[PDB]
């Protein structure tokens, strides 16, 4: 599923992402935008280290979900990476919260640092009723 902007904003809010561990909804929107273009079926194989990024948040198989083909990988969200490719983003949201409970917080995603950090992300939630 390719979410429309405000549709995702409200979907993320209902799932409890607004202010989760101090991260505003706008930051999460900026993250999903740059990571997948709000596409839950998005995938990117990393030939360099044999890992794959899954879903709307492009969560990596090396540490967060199990796909059975990433060497010495971990599964911190304790989910099949397939759960990160559903139209329903509940599981991807549970896993994204898990990622941010770690020291780095939202900085876990390099794209967030590149395209969201210290930037005016207001535009991502404007007019969405959140």
Indicate which residue of 4, 7, 18, 35 is catalytic. Answer: 35
Is residue 7 annotated as a catalytic residue, yes or no? no
Indicate which residue of 4, 18, 53, 87 is catalytic. Answer: 53
Cα–Cα distance for residue pair 115/58, rounded to 1 Å: 15
Resolution (Å units)? 1.8
List all residues 6 or more positions away from 81 whose beta carbon is below 8 Å from its beta carbon: 52, 54, 59, 61, 65, 66, 67
Is residue 53 annotated as a catalytic residue, yes or no? yes
Query: Which of 72, 76, 80 has its CA nearest to residue 64?
Result: 76
For CA atoms 98, 99, 101, 106, give the dihedral sign: negative
Query: Which of 79, 2, 5 has its CA nearest to residue 41?
Result: 2
Report the CATH fold assignment for 1-130.
Lysozyme (1.10.530)
Look-up: residue for tokens 């599981």?
91
Cα–Cα distance for residue pair 75/97, rounded to 1 Å: 14
């Amino acid at each position: 599923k390719v979410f429309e902007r405000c549709e995702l904003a409200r979907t993320l809010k209902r799932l409890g992402m607004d202010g989760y561990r101090g991260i505003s909804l706008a930051n999460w929107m900026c993250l999903a935008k740059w990571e997948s273009g709000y596409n839950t079926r998005a995938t990117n194989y990393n030939a360099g280290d044999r890992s794959t990024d899954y879903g709307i948040f492009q969560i990596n198989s090396r540490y967060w979900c199990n796909d059975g083909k990433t060497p010495g990988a971990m599964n911190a969200c304790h989910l099949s990476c397939s759960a990160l490719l559903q139209d329903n983003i509940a599981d991807a949201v549970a896993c994204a919260k898990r990622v941010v409970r770690d020291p780095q917080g939202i900085r876990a995603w390099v794209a967030w640092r590149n395209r969201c950090q210290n930037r005016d992300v207001r535009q991502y939630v404007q007019g969405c009723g959140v």
